[PDB]
Amino acid sequence: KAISLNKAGKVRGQTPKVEKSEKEKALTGRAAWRAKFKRRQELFTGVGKFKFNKQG
RNA sequence: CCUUGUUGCUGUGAAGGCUGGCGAAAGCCAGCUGGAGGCGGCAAGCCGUAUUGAUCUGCAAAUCAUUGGCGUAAGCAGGGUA
RNA sequence: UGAACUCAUUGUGACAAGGGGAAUCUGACUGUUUAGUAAAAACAUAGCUUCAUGAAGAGAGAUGAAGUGAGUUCUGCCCGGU
RNA sequence: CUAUUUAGACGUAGACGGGUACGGGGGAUUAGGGUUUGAUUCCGGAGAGGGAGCCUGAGAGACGGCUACCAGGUCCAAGGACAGCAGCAGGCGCGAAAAUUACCGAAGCCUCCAAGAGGGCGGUAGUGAAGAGACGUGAAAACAAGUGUGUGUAAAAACCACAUGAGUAACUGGAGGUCAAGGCUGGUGCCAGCAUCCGCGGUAAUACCAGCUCCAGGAGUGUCUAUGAUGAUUGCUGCGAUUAAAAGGUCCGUAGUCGAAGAACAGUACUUGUUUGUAAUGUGGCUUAUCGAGAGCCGAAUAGAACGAGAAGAGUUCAGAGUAAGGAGCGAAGGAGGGCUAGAUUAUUGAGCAGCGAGAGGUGAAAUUUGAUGACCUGCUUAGGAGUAACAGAGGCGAAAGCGCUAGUCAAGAACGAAUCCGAUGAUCAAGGACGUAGGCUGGAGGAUCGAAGACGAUUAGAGACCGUAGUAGUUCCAGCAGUAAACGAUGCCUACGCUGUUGUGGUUAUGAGCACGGCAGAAGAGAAAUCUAGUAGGGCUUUGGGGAGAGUACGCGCGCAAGCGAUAAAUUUAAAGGAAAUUGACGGAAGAACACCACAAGGAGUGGAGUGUGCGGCUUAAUUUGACUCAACGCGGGACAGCUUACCAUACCCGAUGGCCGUGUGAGCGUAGUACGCGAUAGGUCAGAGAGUGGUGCAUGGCCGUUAACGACGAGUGGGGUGACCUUUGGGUUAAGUCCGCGAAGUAGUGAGAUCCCUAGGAUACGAAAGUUAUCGACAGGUGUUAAAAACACAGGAAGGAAGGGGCAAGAACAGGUCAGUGAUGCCCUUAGAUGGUAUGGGCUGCACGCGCACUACAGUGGUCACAGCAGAAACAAAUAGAAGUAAAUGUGAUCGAGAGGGAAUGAGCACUGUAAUGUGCACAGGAACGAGGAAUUGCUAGUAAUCGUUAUCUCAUUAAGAAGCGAUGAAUGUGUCCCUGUUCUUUGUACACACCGCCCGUCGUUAUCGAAGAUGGAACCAGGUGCGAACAAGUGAAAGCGAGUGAGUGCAGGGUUCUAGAUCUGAUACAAGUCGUAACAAGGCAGCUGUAGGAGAACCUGUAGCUGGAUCA
């Protein structure tokens, strides 16, 4: 029974190209760690609930 | 059917037997002894495959040469008898 | 059974004396046959199966008649015609 | 090595052959016990393209020495010459795979005749994210990498010191679960892709492709491939074998592994001391480079060996010792244990004869078939070959397979009783040996009954099968071969420790009990449960399993006359497996109760046939708008359409929340007999954004309906049982109903049923003066008779008698059941001034070859026609001269008509009514079609019911009922039952079904792919041997010429041993979305299934014979 290869690549053609927006140089090493440690202060409490990423 | 004549040389090595080893048994493996067979190679013989050889006014109204088949046997043969 | 020495072509010196292998058709084997154009795959053979009979100077492990052809493995269906 | 003598040497504790390998010190992982690796700094071995010979030397069978062959090369003047990178750089190939044709009088060492010469050995840098350390990528005031001097070295560079500039510096994999971190926004719609595994995507994708935010590790992070761990899935420590994979059919037996008490003895294992035995690595430490790997120094150490010591266990011996260890023997007794000899009561067939005179046989029902040549049945005679009924059992015997009449005879064994004898003789078992139901095979005897194969008769779409008739090999015996069974209690053999009650068999007994061999019922433990040959446990020895498939198959080998049997692989494929036990449902051509005119029995009226009314399909058309399809679509959508309804078709006309921007009284736009007049913000254009739609999707919904079902079920709290999913427990009587009565590991309250409510039947003491109305009352199986309870019936009184009759309301759970065309109920998609929005005039919804559903008039005389009466539910009715809506009709009496004067279909010219419009309705005259009681089928109905007969001040409605929803008149037949059919509930039981029987599933045939066997004839390599021939070198002998043992490379010719590969054709397996023919298995799966063996057959499979329950029976 018939088979064909006519459709290879389709979705990569049809998805509209969007440009990457600019951003700062991010931290690295201990610098990144001081930044994370201040954000997560709630979580280091044994009560209440932190949430890393929410879209509401 | 009755009475008789006619087996020389060699190869292979069945049944039965004795020793030695192995095995708990049953019975297996060596070496030797023994000498069976419409069994192998030949002799005397009996036969008749090939050369489509010789001969075809013959040696001969069926022979001759070389080459072949069997040859310890449902083998070959004289006389008497049906 | 060994070893050495020896020869100018080498030694079963003349005579006597197997060519061998791979396959197929066919008949099991040794044996027999068209005397005088056919030796064969034809005939025979051991084994297998069928048939008829209580009659004998013979008595069913007997006496005669047919067919197939050693061994191994198989041998299906039909009694309408004769 | 050679001469003569002796036959040895080595093997199941694995010889010999073949395959494979540099060996250790050490490395990786690791709680412990282990599993894997070692070309690779140290030690020892071998080699220098492949083989072989050799001179020199203290030392080589040397190759940066020589000589010859074989395979390859280089230069030439063609005559000859030279050469070997598994040294250091370097090049080409091969591969998925690995650096510079660099500097060196310095460090560590080696070589010479040396106050010096040589060394790619060694050292120094360059190159590369194989591995291992320490740190950058900012701080809150103030941060690498640069540069210059000095150092450093053999010379350098880097490193370090001081001094100058300054302000540079993160990526890889992910975000549904395992597994840390987004239902975010846009594309795509089972596509494209993602995903180790599970799984995503069919237009609402937290999983694809991208954007944006998060997470993890970080100068690093992902992937592929080997291995160690995970893993008690290789089990010494430490798994399993009743049913999941797994105890050999039973004995004997060698090698092997394992073996009393008592008294003594000896030291080789065993354990331990002292001394040896380890550079590096590793282990326990300390000291110096800024720190940390690194470097330097210290201490102890494995296996192996030398010499002493201790004697528990192991070992050796002894007999004034004699196992609930074995063998020999004695006494009395028991048993379908075995071989042989001689007898037996019946039965089934066959023949003979006698009696009788028509059928026998066989089945669910029948046919083949046999009988007047006398069957069948009843007598008497006989001839054979099998078998031992009832007694006969959770009884006995045997190693298992197996063994059942009575006597006599011949060997051996088990158990019991007891002061007999010998003394370790024993347990288990590869190899080897003996037995083994049935069916089968080789030869003989025989042949009653039964019966594979083969042949018929039936049944079926077809039966080749099941059933019946018949019939052969076999089924019996003797002498052998064979070697399998669901050969099963699916539970190896010895030996232990272990609770109670009861019942057997054989001996013995102080009569209390024991010993051997059993059955049964609990308990406690155990186990995933079911259950227990399964409890406790490092006792000994053998067999044996490691996810499904392929496969107990291929090749080789051993046995067999054959049939075959024993023993046993790879390639390939796949996420689970009709794997195990239990639980809840669904189903059964399973069992037992119930129930019901949408079930039947007993009956009564029809429908299906004709003509017409109406709906549905099909076809036609400009359009014939559309939903709905077993009950539960089809006079249904309140669907009786002239307009409207109306969604469809033809033509024509009409319109637009708000906000921004722009443009406007010097006039946006509008009317017109459209160009110059009238009216003026109202209604302009463009972007956003509303709203509207009988447009789409009920598989995006709400609400409401229908159906299960009008059925008996339905959940909560507390207690009980089970590891759990889950069950609340024994199913006996009753009702319409888990409605109730009994009884219980359960008990208490509720929903559903009943009660209540509404109508119909009886009832003033109230109200009225009109004569009726309404009514808190009346019936409860209450009374009698039926001897548990709950109940039921038969009588009797009573207006009314067993839910008084009829309605209405009416659990939980469900269904992708219906409706978006009821809705200012509604999500999302679509259209929106040339509209899918309104309006108007017309046309269609009503078209007609034809198949269906439901109704209405009929087929006459139990009728038709004329007239006359006369009666409902109660109360409504201008007028009308042929006739043109209305207050019953069947019916009662008299006439008439007389067997198509029954019947009114298609149609003619008229006469009126409703209406905006006839196409709709009424009336009169003509006309007079089929139909003479309906094939296969099919629908309701138990009493004021069915059927008959009219009527609606009920609904539709201007006009239209042959439709519904009511209402009254006349009024039966038969039963008062049953579970046979059709279904529905409950309880038991089986299951390979859960998507739930419309389920699931087996095998041929045909088509594709992929991997493997065989096969006439063949190719390659690569090893060792056997024969030829023989280059180089050569001891010896010779003045010499020569001659030449021996060591041998190469090469002839035959063979073998290994590994690959070709091959016409045949034959397996696996995957085939769904092709063809049947339906073999799972329910008593429609003939209960399965194991062995033998025939047969399109194919699953069918048939004979013996066996098993894993069976549909613990009886």
Ligand SMILES: [K+]
């Ligand atoms: K001889």
Ligand SMILES: [K+]
């Ligand atoms: K001639």
Ligand SMILES: [K+]
């Ligand atoms: K002459």
Ligand SMILES: [K+]
């Ligand atoms: K010769």
Ligand SMILES: [K+]
């Ligand atoms: K000669």
Ligand SMILES: [K+]
């Ligand atoms: K012959």
Ligand SMILES: [K+]
């Ligand atoms: K002969």
Ligand SMILES: [K+]
């Ligand atoms: K001849």
Ligand SMILES: [K+]
């Ligand atoms: K014949």
Ligand SMILES: [K+]
């Ligand atoms: K013959």
Ligand SMILES: [K+]
């Ligand atoms: K034959």
Ligand SMILES: [K+]
């Ligand atoms: K015939």
Ligand SMILES: [K+]
């Ligand atoms: K005949």
Ligand SMILES: [K+]
């Ligand atoms: K020259």
Ligand SMILES: [K+]
């Ligand atoms: K070299």
Ligand SMILES: [K+]
């Ligand atoms: K090199």
